[PDB]
Amino acid sequence: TGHVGHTMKFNNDGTLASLNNGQPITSVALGDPATNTTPVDMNGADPAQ
Amino acid sequence: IPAEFGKPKQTANIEVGVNLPANGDLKDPTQFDFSDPDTYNRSTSSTIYDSMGQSYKLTTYYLKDQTQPNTWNTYYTVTDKEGEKPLNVAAGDAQTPTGHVGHTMKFNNDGTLASLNNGQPITSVALGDPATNTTPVDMNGADPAQ
């Protein structure tokens, strides 16, 4: 359906192994129609947040 | 014993400070018509005086731009005894197919003012001069170049 998340991996002892294949987790712009297929209706706020 | 005594002074500077609703509906700049309230968002009334002391009603119309975010279109109209004649700005950056010239207001994401009339001061054309305005104000013998 095009919903993009991130994967969290853990070791056998319960400790954190990896997050998003080692890349920082940043989301696409909330109210920007050019980058997000479902832009947030920001009601005049900054769409690039 | 005069009923009215004073020296009339014409209106030259009008300082307006307003807060514009950020959640208001977007409007079409090209479809603006001061006779149709649904084309714009808000309208305020102000009273102005000519050189001879006649009172006139100045109605200010605010439109929220749909094409450009955080952008507002503001129009001016002068009300005389024949009707409500729109007032045009000489160098305003808000233009309509109907020939009504306003000025554009841009705002930053934190809510502060970003720019006014592309950085140029707001000067309106002469009220009663038919050579400068397509809709002259009938100033009743007062100064037409105000």
Cα–Cα distance for residue pair B137/B127, rounded to 1 Å? 5
Q: How far apart are CA B144 and CA B10, in angstroms?
A: 11
> In this structure, are residues B112 and B17 in contact, taking their beta carbons and an 8 Å threshold?
no
CB atoms near residue B89 (< 10 Å): 21
* A47 interfaces chain B, CB cutoff of 8 Å: yes
Structure tokens at B5: 């005594």
Give the other-Cβ count within 10 Å of B103's Cβ: 20
Resolution to 1 decimal, in Å? 3.2
- Measured between beta carbons, the chain A residues lying within 8 angstroms of B109 are 45-46
d(CA B56, CA B121): 23
- Of all residues in chain B, the one with the smallest CA distance to A49 is B109
Q: Are B63 and B71 in contact (CB under 8 A)?
A: no
Q: Which long-range contacts (CB under 8 A, 24 or more apart) does A46-49 make?
A: A46/B109, A47/B69
The CA dihedral of B113, B114, B120, B126, to the nearest 10 degrees, is -40
**Residue B22 sits at the chain A interface (C-beta within 8 Å):** yes
Q: For residues B32 and B39, is the Cβ–Cβ distance under 8 A?
A: yes
List the beta strands (DSSP E) in B1-135: 42-49, 55-64, 71-80, 83-87, 94-95, 101-107, 113-116
Beta pairing class for B55-64 and B42-49: antiparallel
Chain breaks in chain B (C to N over 2.5 A) after: none
CA distances from B14 to A30, B17, B60, B88, B136 (A): 39, 10, 12, 16, 20
Spatial separation of the C-alpha atoms in residues B101 and B120, rounded to whole Å = 14
Cβ atoms B138, B128 nearer than 8 A: yes
User: What are the phi and psi torsion angles at B60 (to 5°)?
Assistant: -105, 125
Cα(A38)–Cα(B124) distance, integer angstroms: 43
